Design an enzyme around this catalytic site. Structure first.
Site, PDB file in Angstrom:
ATOM      1  N   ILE A 153      -4.838  -2.252  -3.179  1.00 52.84           N
ATOM      2  CA  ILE A 153      -5.669  -2.790  -3.928  1.00 52.84           C
ATOM      3  C   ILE A 153      -6.440  -3.805  -2.748  1.00 52.84           C
ATOM      4  O   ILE A 153      -5.772  -4.248  -1.708  1.00 52.84           O
ATOM      5  CB  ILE A 153      -4.707  -4.030  -4.854  1.00 52.84           C
ATOM      6  CG1 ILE A 153      -3.842  -3.157  -5.642  1.00 52.84           C
ATOM      7  CG2 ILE A 153      -5.731  -4.885  -5.363  1.00 52.84           C
ATOM      8  CD1 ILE A 153      -2.826  -3.992  -6.242  1.00 52.84           C
ATOM      9  N   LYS A 167      -1.259  -6.248   5.232  1.00 47.26           N
ATOM     10  CA  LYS A 167      -0.412  -6.481   4.008  1.00 47.26           C
ATOM     11  C   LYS A 167       0.979  -6.694   4.654  1.00 47.26           C
ATOM     12  O   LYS A 167       1.356  -6.107   5.567  1.00 47.26           O
ATOM     13  CB  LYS A 167      -0.228  -4.933   3.262  1.00 47.26           C
ATOM     14  CG  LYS A 167      -1.699  -4.731   2.677  1.00 47.26           C
ATOM     15  CD  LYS A 167      -2.062  -5.617   1.277  1.00 47.26           C
ATOM     16  CE  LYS A 167      -3.290  -5.186   0.932  1.00 47.26           C
ATOM     17  NZ  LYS A 167      -3.499  -5.523  -0.239  1.00 47.26           N
ATOM     18  N   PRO A 187       0.795  -1.421  -0.095  1.00 46.92           N
ATOM     19  CA  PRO A 187       0.142  -0.049   0.104  1.00 46.92           C
ATOM     20  C   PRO A 187       0.839   1.228   0.020  1.00 46.92           C
ATOM     21  O   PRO A 187       1.979   1.181   0.253  1.00 46.92           O
ATOM     22  CB  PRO A 187      -0.928  -0.062   1.200  1.00 46.92           C
ATOM     23  CG  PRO A 187      -0.022  -1.004   2.112  1.00 46.92           C
ATOM     24  CD  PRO A 187       0.658  -1.996   1.209  1.00 46.92           C
TER      25      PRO A 187
END
Lengths: 117, 117, 117
Positions: free
Chosen positions: A64, A32, A1
Site C-alpha cells: 500500500i 515498512k 508488503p
C-alpha cells in the site's frame, strides 16, 4: 508488503536464511516494519528470462502507498537489485522486478480486511 | 512480456525445452522480441481447474500495451491455446489464461524502472 | 474464480484432497458454481510471514464482480480464514489473503475470452 521471488536456482543454490534477510532488506528499502513483510521464495522452477534459461530470478513486490510511482520505484529497484545480485550470485541482467500497488480492502488479515483495522 | 504457467503435470510430463519454445511462441503472438519474453513454469503443483483435479495448466500473461483489449486478447488466447494444448497434451477444457496490463513504472530492470529507459 | 495458495508446509503436512475441498468452500463463500472454481496449491516453499518463517500460508483470490468491496471481502476473509485455519492447522496470525477483481476481457477460456461467451 508482499514479496514473491521465483528462481530457477535449485534450492541448494539459494543461500540459507534468504527469506529472513529479504524481510530485513525490504523493511529498510520500503520504509515498512520488518514484522509486516511477507516473503515467498519458489526455487527450482523452469525459467527463461530475456529469452535465456541461464540462472535468473523474478521478484514481485506489492504494498500500500509506496510502490505506485516511477521515481520511488526507481530507488526501490536499485536497492533490491543490489541485495539480490549479491545474495543469489546473479548479474543485473538476470533479475527483473514488478511492482503492484494494493489498497486496504484487498488485504485479508485476521478474518477481516485492513479497511477495518 | 511475463508468462507464468502453473501445472499439476509432474515435471517429467512437461516436455523438455518448453520454456524456450514458449518464449518463441509468445514473441510471435504478442508482437514482442523473443529476447524480452520471460517464462516461468511451476510444475508438479496440486490443482483443480473447473472443480476437477485432472491434469490442467494456468497461464498468466503480463505486458505493456498489448493485453488490454478483448478483441486482441481473443486472438492471443486462440494462439496460446493452440500452442499449449499440443505442448502439454491437454484438452482446451483444461487450460485457462489471465491477462494483466502493465505500465513502465511497474517494471524494475537493471536497477531502475522502464520509465527511465 | 481463481485461488492460489502458497505454503511452507511440506506437501505431506497439507491434507489430502485440500484442493477439492477448497473448490467447495470457495463456491459457498463467493456464490459461484464449484465447477468454475480453480485452485492452485504450491507447498514446500520458503516463506516468511510477518517476518517469521514458522508454518504459514498465503491465499490469493481473483474473481469478477464479487471481490471488489471492503464489506463483502470482510465476509469472504472471515469464511476463508475459518476454512484454512482448521484445514492447515494454522493460527489466524499465520495466514493472509489478497483479493483481485478481474474483468471478462482478462480471462482466456476455450481459445477466446469471456467477453465473447
Amino acid at each position: 508488503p508482499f514479496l514473491e521471488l521465483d528462481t530457477n536456482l535449485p534450492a541448494n543454490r539459494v543461500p540459507a536464511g534468504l527469506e529472513k534477510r529479504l524481510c530485513a532488506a525490504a523493511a529498510s528499502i520500503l520504509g515498512k516494519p520488518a514484522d509486516r513483510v511477507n516473503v515467498t521464495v519458489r526455487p527450482g522452477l523452469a525459467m527463461a528470462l530475456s529469452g535465456s534459461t541461464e540462472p535468473c530470478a523474478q521478484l514481485s513486490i506489492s504494498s500500500i502507498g509506496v510502490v505506485g510511482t516511477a521515481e520511488d520505484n526507481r530507488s526501490h529497484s536499485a536497492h533490491f537489485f543490489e541485495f539480490l545480485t549479491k545474495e543469489l550470485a546473479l548479474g543485473q541482467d538476470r533479475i527483473l522486478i514488478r511492482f503492484f500497488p494494493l489498497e486496504s480492502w484487498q488485504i485479508g488479515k485476521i478474518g477481516t480486511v485492513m479497511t477495518f483495522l
